[PDB]
């Protein structure tokens, strides 16, 4: 799958990077585990947040398109686009009204961190809607 493609291009990168090689080690040990690939993936992404060297950040972005976060934020925006008028409570609609403005802002300012916080909050609110 495209995750296997990620792994193979990571073979490529590790051939151009030691850290990618360590990630491949992580990958094979996880294969030994064979548990939820996405869970281990997200953990490793957070591990990149941890090590967070410039090279680590680059590798993360490569495996973590970041614009990945952009698409996910777009989906959350569709969620809120439903919620702000079709939510089950006026309070939810008002919070979504705040949040659409907040998202327009974040989009202009286009900060990965601001957008992460916004989307997490959007999920929190959409809990009430769904």
């Amino acid at each position: 799958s495209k995750l296997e493609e990620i792994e193979e291009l990571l073979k490529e990168l590790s051939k151009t990077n030691p850290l990618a090689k360590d990630i491949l080690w992580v990958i094979e040990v996880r294969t030994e585990d064979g548990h939820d690939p996405k869970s281990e993936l997200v953990f490793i992404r957070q591990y990149l947040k941890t090590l967070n060297t410039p090279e680590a950040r680059e590798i993360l972005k490569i495996v973590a398109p970041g614009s990945e976060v952009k698409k996910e934020a777009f989906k959350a925006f569709m969620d809120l686009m439903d919620a702000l008028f079709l939510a089950k409570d006026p309070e939810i609609k008002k919070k979504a009204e705040e949040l659409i403005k907040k998202l327009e802002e974040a989009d202009e300012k286009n900060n990965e961190e601001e957008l992460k916080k916004v989307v997490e909050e959007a999920k929190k609110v959409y809990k009430s809607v769904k």
């Binding site: 614009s67 952009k70 698409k71 934020a73 777009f74 925006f77 569709m78 686009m81 008028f85 989009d107």
Partner: protein, 741 residues
């Protein structure tokens, strides 16, 4: 082609009618939640003037639209200056859309396509986005219903609205509605071909109905899009600043206003950080790092630092950003910190934000500090509010005094605010010092507490002090005047030195303290180290561009390069050996040395020398230039100059004499300034009709045979040539000699 700003429209389409006077939307068009609208609203409601949207489009629950061409059939470009999720258009969840059919779209300068869930909406896969959008990573198109140029199938928005594929030669600059390219400054379309004034969108800038490469002020550059007069720049500014002749919304980093010119600032910018809640508590480095650069502020601050050793370097880089604090600042329970000074600019707590109790500063449980500020050369002041210091008696009121005095806060506190007691009631005085280059005397006197017993000696701390950016103990004297010497120092090295008493801790009457003085002290200079990189490079036969580099140990203010050289008497082995074997065996290698105090030059062009001559070099490094000098042991090299292709030659032809028995005796002369030294002479000779033969003559052979001698020669006219060989190599042959044998 007019221009108007782009806004959003929620459930009220009435504002769409305002687009009739617009050809460009300086922004986007966002239409959302139209439970009010119907097909009658949008089936042919059209604004053909509109030809481009800078940012993007949006269309959600837009109940009634039939074809996207209807509203803006002429719409051609989307600059995508800002793009919702990097997208250009939202078409989602409208069953009325039968098609898009926009028969004028040419290019999307930035972004991809979104369409989804729009029932009845056909002709989506038929679009060849490869030529339209600069970004086609994911033209999101799902859950919808879906003659003309074909690419791999016909490409078209509708079977009639054929895709407006311009000829490839038109580039992104676009083509007219008939398919004829536009000018390079144009983008997308133009009313007439190849005319910068007839474009619809500009590659560089739209200026007064015409595209221009650059914007002429007061019509400065506008966001790589158009030109706006300086009055409108100010209008945007006030409700935007000139940079690179561009009225950008704000100046770049390191810039400051010049009434609306973006003149560079001092680099750092006085950013007015209106603090979150006007506040931020500080205990750990991460907090400050997060807020680095708040050269200006609005709020107070709270401090609970966790420092307990020599590690403050991590900290002030984030600190000191302002000369004042409008509100208060609070600190409590801070760790074993010693210095309360590392805050660069800070000078005045305006205290406008009052700490509880109408205070404007607080300090308690910070029973740690022993350094606060250099008010001696630093200015303090405080505006208003009570200030709290109590329960921090590590340093007692001694310097508090100074603090409230310089703050001018005598009337703003009481002793209630203030209170291990490292508060030196005395400051010892140095008496005498004497200096070597590395070992320096000290002297003082039998100081004693009235209970002289209390004295336990003296604790020194020092350090090398090359610059003024900002470690042993002693015992008591007897009843008598002590002193001190060290060695660890180095020549001409400044050091800061300072002592405090080693004393008894008399508990309840724990003696409050006997400090000492401070002194920046530099040792004596001394003879430096050898100067390195000695390379006697030759620029010319008799010229040597010598070069060195400073020593490892200047050991004083450097004064001169005491250079020294001398010509070398060439080796006697060359005068003793003989090398005349076919396949030449040529060898290979008082006195006041002439000198100079070469100063500021790490090199020298030495003249009067001899090409390829042995020379011994000498250079003492001297940070003194008097007759007596701190001079290092010299650097040296047995330099040899560069040769000449004249000093290994033989002047004139070979002198000769002959005998009746076919015996030839030869003689010749050599230059007296050879390439170092001529050691042998290549010899060649020939008789007419025969072939030339080679021979060697060494200096010993030269002496024994007055040069060269030949025997058993064939009768007839004869010739001889000889070439002198120096240690630099062979020179020029003799003039062809001739004689009869």
């Amino acid at each position: 082609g007019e221009v108007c700003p782009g806004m959003d429209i929620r459930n009220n389409l009435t504002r769409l009618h305002e687009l009739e006077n617009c050809s460009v939307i300086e922004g986007h068009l966002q239409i959302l939640l139209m439970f009010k609208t119907r097909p009658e609203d949008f089936r042919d409601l059209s604004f053909p003037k509109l030809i481009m949207i800078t940012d993007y489009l949006l269309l959600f629950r837009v109940y009634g639209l039939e074809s996207l061409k209807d509203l803006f059939p002429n719409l051609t470009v989307i600059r995508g200056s800002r793009l919702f999720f990097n997208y250009a258009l939202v078409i989602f969840e409208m069953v009325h859309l039968k098609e898009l059919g926009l028969y004028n779209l040419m290019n999307i300068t930035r972004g991809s396509v979104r369409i989804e869930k729009n029932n009845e909406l056909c002709y989506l896969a038929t679009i060849d986005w490869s030529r339209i959008l600069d970004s086609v990573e994911d033209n999101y198109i799902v859950l919808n219903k879906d003659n003309c140029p074909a690419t791999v199938v016909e490409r078209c928005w509708t079977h009639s609205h054929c895709q407006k594929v311009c000829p490839t030669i038109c580039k992104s600059h676009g083509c007219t509605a008939e398919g004829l390219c536009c000018h390079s400054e144009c983008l997308g379309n133009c009313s007439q071909p190849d005319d910068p004034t007839k474009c619809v969108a500009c590659r560089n800038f739209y200026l007064d109905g015409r595209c221009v490469e650059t914007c002429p002020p007061p019509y400065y550059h506008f966001q790589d899009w158009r030109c706006v007069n300086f009055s409108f720049c100010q209008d945007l500014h006030h409700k935007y600043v000139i940079h690179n002749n561009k009225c950008i919304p704000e100046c770049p980093s390191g810039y400051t206003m010049n009434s609306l010119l973006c003149t560079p600032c001092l680099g750092p910018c006085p950013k007015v950080c209106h603090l979150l809640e006007g506040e931020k508590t500080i205990d750990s480095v991460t907090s400050a790092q997060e807020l680095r650069g708040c050269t200006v502020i609005n709020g107070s601050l709270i401090i609970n630092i966790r420092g307990g050793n020599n590690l403050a370097a991590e900290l002030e880089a984030n600190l000191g950003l302002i000369e004042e604090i409008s509100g208060y600042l609070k600190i409590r329970r801070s760790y074993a910190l010693v210095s309360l000074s590392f805050f660069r600019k800070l000078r005045l707590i305006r205290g406008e934000t009052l700490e509880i109790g109408n205070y404007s500063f607080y300090a308690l449980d910070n029973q740690n500090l022993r350094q606060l500020w250099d008010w001696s050369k630093h200015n303090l002041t405080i505006t208003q509010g009570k200030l709290f210091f109590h329960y921090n008696p590590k340093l007692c009121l001694s310097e508090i005094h100074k603090m409230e005095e310089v703050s001018g806060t005598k009337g703003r506190q009481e002793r209630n605010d203030i209170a291990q007691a490292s508060c030196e009631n005395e400051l010892l005085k140095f008496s005498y010092i004497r200096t070597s280059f590395d070992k320096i005397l000290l002297r003082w006197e039998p100081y004693w507490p009235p209970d002289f017993r209390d004295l336990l000696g003296f604790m020194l701390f020092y350090k090398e002090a090359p610059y003024q950016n900002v470690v042993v103990d002693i015992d008591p004297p007897l009843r008598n005047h002590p002193g001190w010497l060290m060695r660890g120092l180095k020549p001409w090295t400044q050091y800061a030195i300072f002592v405090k008493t080693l004393v008894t801790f008399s508990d309840e009457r724990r003696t409050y303290g006997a400090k000492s003085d401070i002194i920046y002290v530099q040792t004596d200079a001394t003879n430096p180290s050898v100067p390195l990189d000695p390379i006697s490079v030759s620029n010319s036969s008799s010229q040597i561009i010598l070069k060195w580099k400073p020593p490892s140990d200047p050991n004083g203010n450097i004064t001169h390069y005491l250079v020294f050289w001398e010509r070398q008497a060439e080796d006697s082995e060359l005068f003793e050996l003989d090398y005349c074997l076919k396949g030449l065996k040529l060898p290979s290698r008082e006195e006041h040395r002439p000198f100079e105090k070469v100063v500021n030059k790490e090199s020298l062009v030495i003249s009067g020398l001899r090409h390829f001559t042995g020379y011994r070099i000498e250079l003492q490094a001297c940070n003194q230039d008097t007759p007596e000098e701190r001079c290092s042991v010299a650097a040296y090299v047995s330099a040899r100059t560069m040769p000449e292709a004249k000093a290994d030659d033989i002047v004139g032809p070979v002198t000769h004499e002959i005998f009746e028995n076919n015996v030839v005796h030869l003689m010749w002369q050599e230059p007296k300034e050879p390439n170092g030294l001529i050691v042998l002479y290549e010899v060649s000779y020939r008789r007419y009709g025969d072939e030339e033969l080679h021979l060697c003559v060494s200096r010993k052979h030269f002496a024994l045979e007055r040069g060269c001698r030949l025997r058993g020669l064939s009768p007839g006219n004869y010739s001889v040539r000889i070439r002198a060989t120096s240690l630099a190599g062979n020179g020029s042959w003799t003039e062809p000699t001739y004689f009869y044998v």
